[PDB]
Structure formats: C-alpha cells, structure tokens
CSV table of C-alpha atoms in Angstrom, one decimal:
chain,number,residue,atom,x,y,z
A,1,UNK,CA,5.4,26.8,41.5
A,2,UNK,CA,8.1,25.0,43.8
A,3,UNK,CA,6.4,22.1,43.5
A,4,UNK,CA,5.9,22.0,39.9
A,5,UNK,CA,9.8,22.8,39.4
A,6,UNK,CA,10.7,19.9,41.6
A,7,UNK,CA,8.4,17.6,39.8
A,8,UNK,CA,9.4,18.2,36.3
A,9,UNK,CA,13.3,18.2,37.6
A,10,UNK,CA,12.5,14.7,39.3
A,11,UNK,CA,11.0,13.4,36.0
A,12,UNK,CA,13.8,14.7,34.2
A,13,UNK,CA,16.1,13.1,36.4
A,14,UNK,CA,14.2,9.9,36.1
A,15,UNK,CA,14.9,10.0,32.3
A,16,UNK,CA,18.7,10.8,33.0
A,17,UNK,CA,18.7,7.7,35.3
A,18,UNK,CA,17.2,5.5,32.6
A,19,UNK,CA,20.0,6.8,30.2
A,20,UNK,CA,22.6,5.8,32.9
A,21,UNK,CA,20.9,2.2,33.1
A,22,UNK,CA,21.2,2.0,29.2
A,23,UNK,CA,24.8,3.1,29.1
A,24,UNK,CA,25.6,0.5,32.0
A,25,UNK,CA,23.7,-2.1,30.1
A,26,UNK,CA,25.7,-1.4,26.9
A,27,UNK,CA,29.0,-1.4,28.6
A,28,UNK,CA,27.9,-4.6,30.5
A,29,UNK,CA,27.3,-6.4,27.3
A,30,UNK,CA,30.7,-5.2,25.8
A,31,UNK,CA,32.2,-6.6,28.9
A,32,UNK,CA,30.3,-9.7,28.4
A,33,UNK,CA,31.7,-10.3,25.0
A,34,UNK,CA,35.3,-9.6,26.3
A,35,UNK,CA,34.6,-12.4,28.7
A,36,UNK,CA,33.5,-14.8,26.2
A,37,UNK,CA,36.7,-13.9,24.4
A,38,UNK,CA,39.1,-14.5,27.5
A,39,UNK,CA,37.4,-17.9,28.1
A,40,UNK,CA,38.5,-19.0,24.5
A,41,UNK,CA,41.9,-17.6,24.9
A,42,UNK,CA,42.2,-19.3,28.2
A,43,UNK,CA,41.2,-22.6,26.9
A,44,UNK,CA,43.6,-22.2,23.8
A,45,UNK,CA,46.3,-21.3,26.3
A,46,UNK,CA,45.8,-24.5,28.0
A,47,UNK,CA,45.7,-26.5,24.9
A,48,UNK,CA,48.9,-24.9,23.6
A,49,UNK,CA,50.5,-25.5,27.1
A,50,UNK,CA,50.6,-29.3,26.0
A,51,UNK,CA,54.1,-30.0,24.9
B,1,UNK,CA,7.1,0.6,30.1
B,2,UNK,CA,4.1,1.1,27.5
B,3,UNK,CA,6.1,1.6,24.4
B,4,UNK,CA,4.9,-0.1,21.1
B,5,UNK,CA,7.5,1.0,18.5
B,6,UNK,CA,10.5,-1.0,19.8
B,7,UNK,CA,10.1,-4.2,21.9
B,8,UNK,CA,13.4,-4.9,23.9
B,9,UNK,CA,12.1,-8.2,25.0
B,10,UNK,CA,11.4,-9.5,21.5
B,11,UNK,CA,15.0,-8.5,20.4
B,12,UNK,CA,16.4,-10.4,23.5
B,13,UNK,CA,14.4,-13.4,22.7
B,14,UNK,CA,15.5,-13.3,19.0
B,15,UNK,CA,19.4,-13.0,20.0
B,16,UNK,CA,18.9,-15.9,22.5
B,17,UNK,CA,17.2,-18.0,19.9
B,18,UNK,CA,19.8,-17.3,17.4
B,19,UNK,CA,22.4,-18.3,20.1
B,20,UNK,CA,20.8,-21.6,20.7
B,21,UNK,CA,20.0,-22.2,16.7
B,22,UNK,CA,24.0,-21.8,16.2
B,23,UNK,CA,24.6,-24.2,18.7
B,24,UNK,CA,22.0,-26.7,17.3
B,25,UNK,CA,23.7,-26.2,14.1
B,26,UNK,CA,27.1,-26.9,15.1
B,27,UNK,CA,25.7,-30.0,16.9
B,28,UNK,CA,23.9,-31.3,13.9
B,29,UNK,CA,27.0,-30.8,11.7
B,30,UNK,CA,29.2,-32.7,14.2
B,31,UNK,CA,26.5,-35.7,14.1
B,32,UNK,CA,26.1,-35.7,10.3
B,33,UNK,CA,29.9,-35.5,9.4
B,34,UNK,CA,31.0,-37.5,12.4
B,35,UNK,CA,34.0,-35.3,13.0
B,36,UNK,CA,34.1,-32.9,15.9
B,37,UNK,CA,36.8,-30.9,14.4
B,38,UNK,CA,35.1,-29.9,11.1
B,39,UNK,CA,35.1,-26.6,9.5
B,40,UNK,CA,38.5,-25.6,11.1
B,41,UNK,CA,36.9,-22.4,12.8
B,42,UNK,CA,36.2,-25.2,15.5
B,43,UNK,CA,39.5,-25.8,17.1
B,44,UNK,CA,41.9,-24.7,14.4
B,45,UNK,CA,45.0,-26.4,15.9
B,46,UNK,CA,43.0,-29.8,16.2
B,47,UNK,CA,42.5,-29.9,12.4
B,48,UNK,CA,46.1,-29.2,11.9
B,49,UNK,CA,47.1,-32.1,14.1
B,50,UNK,CA,44.5,-34.4,12.3
C,1,UNK,CA,21.0,-2.0,24.0
C,2,UNK,CA,21.0,1.1,21.8
C,3,UNK,CA,17.7,0.3,20.7
C,4,UNK,CA,16.6,0.5,24.2
C,5,UNK,CA,18.4,3.6,24.7
C,6,UNK,CA,16.3,5.1,21.8
C,7,UNK,CA,13.2,3.7,23.3
C,8,UNK,CA,14.0,5.3,26.8
C,9,UNK,CA,14.2,8.8,25.2
C,10,UNK,CA,12.1,8.5,21.7
C,11,UNK,CA,9.3,6.1,22.4
C,12,UNK,CA,6.1,7.4,23.8
C,13,UNK,CA,4.9,6.0,27.2
C,14,UNK,CA,1.1,5.0,26.3
C,15,UNK,CA,0.2,4.6,29.9
C,16,UNK,CA,0.8,8.4,30.8
C,17,UNK,CA,-0.1,9.7,27.2
C,18,UNK,CA,-3.5,8.2,27.4
C,19,UNK,CA,-4.3,9.4,30.9
C,20,UNK,CA,-3.1,12.9,29.6
C,21,UNK,CA,-5.7,12.5,26.7
C,22,UNK,CA,-8.3,11.6,29.0
C,23,UNK,CA,-7.6,14.6,31.2
C,24,UNK,CA,-7.3,16.8,28.0
C,25,UNK,CA,-10.8,15.6,26.9
C,26,UNK,CA,-12.3,16.2,30.2
C,27,UNK,CA,-10.9,19.7,30.4
C,28,UNK,CA,-12.2,20.3,26.8
C,29,UNK,CA,-15.7,19.4,27.9
C,30,UNK,CA,-15.5,21.6,31.1
C,31,UNK,CA,-14.0,24.4,29.2
C,32,UNK,CA,-16.9,24.2,26.5
C,33,UNK,CA,-19.4,24.1,29.3
C,34,UNK,CA,-17.9,26.9,31.5
C,35,UNK,CA,-17.5,29.2,28.4
C,36,UNK,CA,-21.2,28.6,27.6
C,37,UNK,CA,-22.2,29.6,31.0
C,38,UNK,CA,-19.8,32.7,30.8
C,39,UNK,CA,-21.8,33.5,27.6
C,40,UNK,CA,-25.1,33.6,29.4
C,41,UNK,CA,-23.5,35.9,32.0
C,42,UNK,CA,-24.3,39.2,30.5
C,43,UNK,CA,-27.8,38.1,29.4
C,44,UNK,CA,-28.8,38.7,33.3
C,45,UNK,CA,-28.1,42.4,32.5
C,46,UNK,CA,-30.9,42.0,29.6
C,47,UNK,CA,-33.4,41.6,32.4
C,48,UNK,CA,-34.1,45.2,33.5
C,49,UNK,CA,-34.9,47.6,30.9
D,1,UNK,CA,-19.6,45.2,36.7
D,2,UNK,CA,-22.8,44.8,34.3
D,3,UNK,CA,-21.0,45.8,31.1
D,4,UNK,CA,-22.1,44.1,28.0
D,5,UNK,CA,-19.4,45.6,25.5
D,6,UNK,CA,-16.8,43.2,26.7
D,7,UNK,CA,-16.8,39.9,28.6
D,8,UNK,CA,-13.6,39.1,30.4
D,9,UNK,CA,-14.9,35.8,31.7
D,10,UNK,CA,-15.4,34.6,28.1
D,11,UNK,CA,-11.9,35.6,27.1
D,12,UNK,CA,-10.4,33.8,30.1
D,13,UNK,CA,-12.5,30.8,29.2
D,14,UNK,CA,-11.3,30.8,25.5
D,15,UNK,CA,-7.8,31.0,26.7
D,16,UNK,CA,-8.1,28.0,29.1
D,17,UNK,CA,-9.8,26.2,26.4
D,18,UNK,CA,-6.9,26.7,24.0
D,19,UNK,CA,-4.5,25.6,26.6
D,20,UNK,CA,-6.4,22.5,27.0
D,21,UNK,CA,-6.8,21.9,23.2
D,22,UNK,CA,-2.8,22.1,22.8
D,23,UNK,CA,-2.5,19.5,25.4
D,24,UNK,CA,-5.1,17.4,23.7
D,25,UNK,CA,-3.2,17.8,20.4
D,26,UNK,CA,0.3,17.0,21.7
D,27,UNK,CA,-1.0,14.0,23.6
D,28,UNK,CA,-2.9,12.9,20.4
D,29,UNK,CA,0.2,13.1,18.1
D,30,UNK,CA,2.2,11.3,20.6
D,31,UNK,CA,-0.3,8.4,20.9
D,32,UNK,CA,-0.8,8.5,17.0
D,33,UNK,CA,3.0,8.5,16.0
D,34,UNK,CA,4.0,6.5,19.1
D,35,UNK,CA,7.1,8.8,19.4
D,36,UNK,CA,7.2,10.9,22.3
D,37,UNK,CA,9.7,13.3,20.7
D,38,UNK,CA,8.7,14.4,17.3
D,39,UNK,CA,8.2,17.9,16.0
D,40,UNK,CA,11.5,18.7,17.7
D,41,UNK,CA,9.9,21.9,19.3
D,42,UNK,CA,9.5,19.3,22.3
D,43,UNK,CA,12.8,18.3,23.6
D,44,UNK,CA,15.1,19.6,21.1
D,45,UNK,CA,18.3,17.8,22.6
D,46,UNK,CA,16.2,14.6,22.8
D,47,UNK,CA,15.7,14.3,19.0
D,48,UNK,CA,19.4,14.9,18.4
D,49,UNK,CA,20.4,12.0,20.6
D,50,UNK,CA,17.6,9.8,19.1
E,1,UNK,CA,28.5,-22.4,0.9
E,2,UNK,CA,27.0,-20.0,-1.8
E,3,UNK,CA,23.5,-21.0,-0.8
E,4,UNK,CA,24.5,-20.1,2.7
E,5,UNK,CA,25.8,-16.7,1.5
E,6,UNK,CA,22.5,-16.1,-0.3
E,7,UNK,CA,20.8,-16.7,3.0
E,8,UNK,CA,22.6,-14.2,4.9
E,9,UNK,CA,21.7,-11.6,2.4
E,10,UNK,CA,18.7,-12.3,0.4
E,11,UNK,CA,16.0,-14.2,2.6
E,12,UNK,CA,14.2,-12.7,5.7
E,13,UNK,CA,14.6,-13.7,9.5
E,14,UNK,CA,11.2,-14.7,10.6
E,15,UNK,CA,12.1,-13.8,14.1
E,16,UNK,CA,12.2,-10.2,13.2
E,17,UNK,CA,9.3,-10.4,10.6
E,18,UNK,CA,6.8,-11.6,13.0
E,19,UNK,CA,7.6,-9.0,15.7
E,20,UNK,CA,7.6,-6.3,13.0
E,21,UNK,CA,4.2,-7.3,11.9
E,22,UNK,CA,2.9,-7.6,15.4
E,23,UNK,CA,4.2,-4.1,16.2
E,24,UNK,CA,2.8,-2.7,12.9
E,25,UNK,CA,-0.5,-4.1,13.8
E,26,UNK,CA,-0.6,-2.7,17.4
E,27,UNK,CA,0.5,0.7,15.8
E,28,UNK,CA,-2.2,0.7,13.2
E,29,UNK,CA,-5.0,-0.2,15.6
E,30,UNK,CA,-4.0,2.6,17.8
E,31,UNK,CA,-3.6,5.0,15.2
E,32,UNK,CA,-7.2,4.1,14.1
E,33,UNK,CA,-8.6,4.7,17.5
E,34,UNK,CA,-6.6,8.1,18.1
E,35,UNK,CA,-7.9,9.2,14.6
E,36,UNK,CA,-11.4,8.4,15.8
E,37,UNK,CA,-10.8,10.6,18.9
E,38,UNK,CA,-9.4,13.2,16.8
E,39,UNK,CA,-12.1,13.4,14.6
E,40,UNK,CA,-14.4,13.5,17.8
E,41,UNK,CA,-12.2,16.3,19.1
E,42,UNK,CA,-14.0,19.1,17.0
E,43,UNK,CA,-17.4,18.0,18.3
E,44,UNK,CA,-17.0,20.1,21.3
E,45,UNK,CA,-17.2,23.0,19.1
E,46,UNK,CA,-20.6,22.0,18.6
E,47,UNK,CA,-21.7,22.2,22.1
E,48,UNK,CA,-22.2,25.9,22.8
E,49,UNK,CA,-25.0,27.4,20.8
F,1,UNK,CA,1.0,-3.8,-10.0
F,2,UNK,CA,-2.0,-2.7,-12.4
F,3,UNK,CA,-4.4,-3.2,-9.7
F,4,UNK,CA,-2.2,-1.4,-7.1
F,5,UNK,CA,-2.0,1.5,-9.7
F,6,UNK,CA,-5.6,1.7,-10.2
F,7,UNK,CA,-6.1,1.6,-6.4
F,8,UNK,CA,-3.6,4.6,-6.2
F,9,UNK,CA,-6.0,6.7,-8.4
F,10,UNK,CA,-9.5,5.3,-8.0
F,11,UNK,CA,-10.5,4.1,-4.4
F,12,UNK,CA,-11.1,6.2,-1.3
F,13,UNK,CA,-8.8,6.8,1.7
F,14,UNK,CA,-11.4,6.0,4.3
F,15,UNK,CA,-9.4,7.7,6.9
F,16,UNK,CA,-9.7,11.2,4.9
F,17,UNK,CA,-13.1,10.3,3.9
F,18,UNK,CA,-14.4,9.8,7.4
F,19,UNK,CA,-12.6,12.8,8.5
F,20,UNK,CA,-14.4,14.7,5.7
F,21,UNK,CA,-17.8,13.4,6.5
F,22,UNK,CA,-17.5,14.3,10.2
F,23,UNK,CA,-16.4,17.7,9.5
F,24,UNK,CA,-19.2,18.1,7.1
F,25,UNK,CA,-21.6,16.9,9.6
F,26,UNK,CA,-20.3,19.5,12.1
F,27,UNK,CA,-20.6,22.2,9.4
F,28,UNK,CA,-24.1,21.0,8.8
F,29,UNK,CA,-25.2,21.3,12.4
F,30,UNK,CA,-23.5,24.5,12.8
F,31,UNK,CA,-24.9,26.0,9.6
F,32,UNK,CA,-28.7,25.1,10.8
F,33,UNK,CA,-28.1,26.5,14.3
F,34,UNK,CA,-26.6,29.8,12.9
F,35,UNK,CA,-29.3,29.9,10.4
F,36,UNK,CA,-31.8,29.5,13.2
F,37,UNK,CA,-30.4,32.3,15.2
F,38,UNK,CA,-30.4,34.3,11.8
F,39,UNK,CA,-34.0,33.9,11.3
F,40,UNK,CA,-34.8,35.8,14.4
F,41,UNK,CA,-32.5,38.9,13.6
F,42,UNK,CA,-35.6,40.7,12.4
F,43,UNK,CA,-37.5,39.8,15.4
F,44,UNK,CA,-35.6,42.7,17.1
F,45,UNK,CA,-37.4,45.0,14.9
F,46,UNK,CA,-40.7,43.4,15.9
F,47,UNK,CA,-40.2,44.9,19.4
F,48,UNK,CA,-40.9,48.7,18.9
F,49,UNK,CA,-44.1,49.6,17.1
C-alpha cells in the first residue's frame, strides 16, 4: 500500500513536472519574442543616432 | 510520447517553414522590384529619406 | 506551446495504454478460466451420495 | 466446507473479473478517443484545465 | 493586396492540412483496431459453459 | 449532395453492422449451449425409477 501510494504520487509528480516544463516553454517563447523586438529597437536606435 | 491527437513537432516544423517562407518572400520582392526599401514596413525611416 | 501543454494533460500515451489493455485482456481470460474452475468446485460434492 | 447452496469463490472471481473488465473498458476508451481525460470522472481538474 | 487578403482568410494552409489528414488517418486506423478488440471483448463471456 | 443524402438513409454503417453480427453470433452460440443444457433437464427425472 505504501508502494502504491508512492508510485501514484510520483506519476502525478511527473505530470506536474511536465506542466512546469510547458509553462517554462511558454515563458521562453514570449521572452524570445521580446528579444527579437529588442534587436529591432537597438538597430533603429543605432540608425537614428546618426545625425 | 506516444500521442496522436496533437503532434508538437509538426507545429514546430510548420512555424519554422513559415519563417523561412517569409524571408524568401521579402528576398523575392527585393529582387523583383530592385528596391531594398519597398513596402515601408521595411526600414520605415529609409523610405522617408528616399 | 499551449497545444503541447494540452497534450501533456489531455492526450493519451498509447505506449502505456496499449500495455494496460493487454494486461486487462490477460486478466479477463484468466478470470474467465478461474471462474469456470471455481464453478466446478461444488461438483466434487456431487460425487458421494 | 462442502456446501452447495452458495459459492464464495465464484463471487470473488466475478468481482475480480468485473474489476479487470472496467480497466479494459477505460483503456479501450482512451485508445479509441485518443484522449486520456474524457468522461470527466477521471481527473476532473484535468479536463477543466484542458 | 486584396488577393493576398483573401488568401489570409479563404484558402487553406497545406502544412496544417496534410498534418491534420495524417493524424486523422492514424486515429481512424487505431479506432478500427480498438473497435475490433472491443467486439472481441464479449467473446470471453462465451468461454465458461 | 443527393448521393450523400441517399447514403445517409440507405447504406449500412459497417462498424455497427459488424458489431451486431458479432453480438448475434455470441447470442447464437450461447443459445445453442443453453438449449443443450436445457435438454438434459428431464434427464434428472430419469434417475429415480
């Protein structure tokens, strides 16, 4: 019974960890888009810094 | 794992193919028109200067 | 990413589901057989009379 | 004992057979639909999140 | 520009469509096989006699 | 469209039809078995004489 409880808990924990992986993936994708923006702002700032 | 309903790898491939196709489209438009700054969305200030 | 999130919680893992089905079928045939042999258990009583 | 009116072993076998059949049924539905969480009775919060 | 606008709405993206068709085929074949096993399930009843 | 409409009312859903055929076969074998066991019900009478 202890083993069954531990096994079910660990499988549910693996599911929770998969959810964490997916959450990190969404955050990572959003941050990548912010990065792609920041490159464009930097390039345009370099352009506009020309007098 | 062994899922059938949703294939994440297919979605990744489609998105990357879309990025490549967008780059190809911009390159083809630049070649055809001969103007790098066409459709001012590309380098908005450049088109004003031009 | 959200579609992957949904897959992680909604879609079925065929690798384990098929094994579960196979073990269930094995248990089904075993259960039918053992239920039969349990049904011939009282016939041994119907030997002495 | 050698009683013939009732058979406890048959009843136990029937119960275990029913449990195995229920497991077979849920596995068969999960294969056929391809969705682990259908018929919300399994993982009620899972279907809400999905 | 209006032809492009019609494209963004009307016509279909083959990259998604081919993948959807493949997934549907896999699902249909899996469903046929599991239905065969489902109709095989009550055969165990016709074991004890 | 009319061919599809005729299909909706005329042709047979082979999934359901095969399920019904398998079920009917199970009922046939079960019926002949239970009838066989029903035929020796009076044989118990042909014990005391």
